[PDB]
Design a protein around this ligand. Structure first.
Ligand SMILES: *[C@H](CS(=O)(=O)c1ccccc1)[C@H](CCc1ccccc1)NC(=O)[C@H](CCS(=O)(=O)c1ccccc1)NC(=O)N1CCOCC1
Length: 217
């Protein structure tokens, strides 16, 4: 395993998106993971439809559109549905709509997904390096998270009580302090150009390694 990894360098991460008034962070976290796999298997990088998950991966999957969801059930939907549209053909309107999936504009498919063991940052590291970007949940209820702008984020009062779905696109160390490179979905005005570096190997800080998962085409 390399001392550091940044899947952006490998051209496997689309542009940071802005979820707006719709709390579909789970939707963005899920598509982000698939996008990296689509690129890794077709040399083509395309933003996948988050709206597609918000309108179609609903009750049967335990998801509530703009009111919250699960990355794993989002993957199962893509498998059951055998496809998901691209952002271009099924744009993000930031609100729940009637499912408008159209296989004519399918951009990717999913074969299965894997959930990693709870709290194991060493397994997450091995996955991020060898498999690609991993979808994880983090405790982002503290203001210190919102006010973030630079450096390795460390919040003493963080817990493993996750509530926000995001994407781990790499890891490394900045001045001795280890970190996870996390892509957020609050626009480019958050942290450093939409990303945030979170403390690594600090006892599953903010529960970043609590519920990791990634898709496989
Ligand atoms: C996205 C997070 S957000 O940007 O912090 C946000 C804060 C406030 C309002 C909107 C978004 C999203 C927010 C849900 C929400 C909550 C309250 C009001 C409106 C919207 N969070 C979720 O969708 C999470 C994602 C799953 S997780 O990463 O927390 C996780 C937990 C357990 C195992 C694995 C991963 N899920 C939910 O919030 N819910 C609630 C509804 O039922 C489905 C799951």
């Amino acid at each position: 395993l390399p001392d550091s990894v940044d899947w952006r360098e490998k051209g496997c991460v689309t542009e940071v998106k802005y979820q707006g008034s719709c709390g579909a962070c789970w939707a963005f976290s899920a598509v982000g993971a698939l996008e990296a796999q689509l690129k890794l298997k077709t040399g083509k990088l395309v933003s996948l439809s988050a709206q597609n998950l918000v309108d179609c991966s609903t009750e049967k999957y335990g998801n509530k559109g703009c009111n919250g969801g699960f990355m794993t059930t989002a993957f199962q939907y893509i498998i059951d549905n055998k496809g998901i549209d691209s952002d271009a053909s099924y744009p993000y309107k930031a609100m729940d709509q009637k499912c408008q999936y159209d296989s004519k504009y399918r951009a990717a498919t999913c074969r299965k997904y894997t959930e990693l063991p709870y709290g194991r940052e060493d397994v997450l590291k091995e996955a991020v390096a060898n498999k690609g970007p991993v979808s994880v949940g983090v405790d982002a209820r503290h203001p210190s998270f919102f006010l973030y702008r630079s450096g390795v984020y460390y919040e003493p009062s963080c817990t493993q009580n996750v509530n926000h779905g995001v994407l781990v696109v790499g890891y490394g160390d900045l001045n001795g302090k280890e970190y996870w490179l996390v892509k957020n979905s609050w626009g480019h005005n958050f942290g450093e150009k939409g990303y945030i570096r979170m403390a690594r190997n600090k006892g599953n800080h903010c529960g970043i390694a609590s519920f990791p998962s990634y898709p496989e085409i």
